[PDB]
């Protein structure tokens, strides 16, 4: 009965040279029982990408909630929301439920369409913003991801190189966690093209 570790799952985001990458596993379980190997944890609202780990009901709820909010934002502002702004919206929305929070570990990733600057950010379940140059980690194998990312990561990686680094960071971290794995997805994000790759990983 620890909400953050019932369903399980992981998300990791990295910055490269004029690019960002965000990756997640596909597992959804009920503790020991694996239930779904198709449960994607990365969503997008225009060019801003959001990965959410934690309690799956809240992952689904928050996706639906941010889709709702970014749609009204776009209608009123007459432009797509930027990563820096969206990050603040996520923080606001989470802290609004300070004493009854969503049991989630969200991760924002995207490129500012105006400045062209790669941007990533992480949050705790209560909305504290964790901005980073290099990488953000979230989920039941966050310790593993921290250890992988801290050793494998180097700055200004090309998209093709960055893909390998993030992919290896997720896979090897997921294989040391019981509640993570069962398939993986990696988003490589350039200024005006986005490639989505499904990784082959061990299915145990």
């Amino acid at each position: 009965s620890d909400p953050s570790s019932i369903n399980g799952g992981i998300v990791v985001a990295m910055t490269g040279k004029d690019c960002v990458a965000i990756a997640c596993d596909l597992r959804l379980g009920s503790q020991s029982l694996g239930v779904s190997n198709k449960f994607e944890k990365i969503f997008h609202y225009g060019h801003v990408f959001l990965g959410i780990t934690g309690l799956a009901t809240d992952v689904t709820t928050l996706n639906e909630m941010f889709r709702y909010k970014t749609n009204l934002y776009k209608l009123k502002e007459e432009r797509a929301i930027e990563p820096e702004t969206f990050t603040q919206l996520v923080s606001s929305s989470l802290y609004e439920r300070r004493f009854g929070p969503y049991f989630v570990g969200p991760v924002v990733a995207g490129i500012n369409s105006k400045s062209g600057k790669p941007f990533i950010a992480g949050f705790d379940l209560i909305g504290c913003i964790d901005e980073a140059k290099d990488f953000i980690v979230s989920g039941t194998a966050s310790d593993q991801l921290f250890g992988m990312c801290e050793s494998l990561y180097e700055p200004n990686l090309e998209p093709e190189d960055l893909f390998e680094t993030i992919s290896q960071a997720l896979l090897n971290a997921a294989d040391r966690d019981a509640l993570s794995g069962w398939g993986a997805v990696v988003y490589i994000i350039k200024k005006d093209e986005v490639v989505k790759r499904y990784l082959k990983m061990r299915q145990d």
């Binding site: 705790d124 379940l125 964790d130």
Partner: peptide
Amino acid sequence: XAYX
């Protein structure tokens, strides 16, 4: 959660 994060907590100097």
